[PDB]
């Protein structure tokens, strides 16, 4: 049991400020009160939201999911609290080793040379602007797809 | 300062169903624990069953599981436990607690939860 409440316990996902240095940060109130999030995974990519966030009591295990080309954040609608509270606010994504299928052998294309000859770049923007995010960046050393969304 | 309302208990045979609710209200619930808990006459207070507000999911007690659950109206700011085959053994005051905080206690602890409701009786008559 975390002393800020916070429920995050799977492997290779992280927080920043640290799980630890979170345990070490809960107020007078007992609330745990940052301002920057972040919640990231290891060989997939992380979530940055800015500004001030409370993370007491926050169940991340249920809440948040990043996986390859794809996160989740609240996995239905249900259970999605309003405009602005939890995590139902702007952020911006990065899933990392997001890279196309060479159909020659099924196997992945990492140069960067060859992303670029096939534009690859405007693939992960047309399916951003499809999704109703913003696009930002395509990284392709790492293969990572940046985008902003107003809310989850 | 926070206010915990429970209602929906009273009488009912036994075999039945019964769903208390508990409203709550004062301040904002979206970073909360809430939880269920009786006391029969005599023993310590009992835990049923928490809920985390920020992504919902429950967690129900061994000793009622399979009977009990707890879900909510977010937009009510209320909790609900649903009773089904209702017992003798179920009579007691049950109670709603919720925090708004952090803690060293486990969820199943009552020094987990700083607010608590005033309580409500079920009497399970065979």
């Known amino acids: 049991s975390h002393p800020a409440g916070i429920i995050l316990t799977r492997d290779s996902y992280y927080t920043i400020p640290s799980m630890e240095e979170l345990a070490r940060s809960v107020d007078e109130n007992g609330e745990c009160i940052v301002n920057g999030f972040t919640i990231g995974r290891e060989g997939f990519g992380s979530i940055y939201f800015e500004g001030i966030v409370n993370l007491t009591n926050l169940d991340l295990d249920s809440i948040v999911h990043i996986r390859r080309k794809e996160v989740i954040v609240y996995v239905d609608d249900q259970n999605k609290p309003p405009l602005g509270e939890g995590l139902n606010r702007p952020a911006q994504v990065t899933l990392d080793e997001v890279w196309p299928i060479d159909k020659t052998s099924r196997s992945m294309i990492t140069s960067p040379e060859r992303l670029s000859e096939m534009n690859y770049k405007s693939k992960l923007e047309n399916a951003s602007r499809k999704q109703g995010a913003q696009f930002v960046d395509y990284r392709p050393e790492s293969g990572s797809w940046v985008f902003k969304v107003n809310h989850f | 300062q926070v206010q915990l309302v429970e209602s929906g208990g009273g009488p009912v045979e036994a075999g039945g169903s019964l769903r208390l609710s508990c409203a709550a209200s004062g301040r904002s619930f979206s970073n909360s624990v809430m939880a269920w808990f009786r006391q029969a006459p005599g023993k310590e207070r009992e835990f049923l069953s928490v809920?985390?507000?920020?992504?919902?999911?429950?967690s129900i007690a061994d000793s009622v599981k399979g009977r009990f659950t707890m879900s909510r109206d977010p937009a009510k700011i209320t909790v609900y436990l649903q009773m089904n085959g209702l017992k003798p053994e179920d009579t007691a005051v049950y109670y709603c607690?919720?925090?708004?905080?952090?803690?060293?206690?486990?969820?199943?602890?009552?020094?987990?939860?700083?607010?608590w409701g005033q309580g409500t009786q079920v009497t399970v008559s065979s």
């Open positions: 809920l985390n507000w920020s992504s919902g999911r429950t």
């Open positions: 607690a919720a925090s708004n905080r952090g803690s060293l206690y486990t969820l199943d602890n009552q020094n987990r939860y700083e607010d």
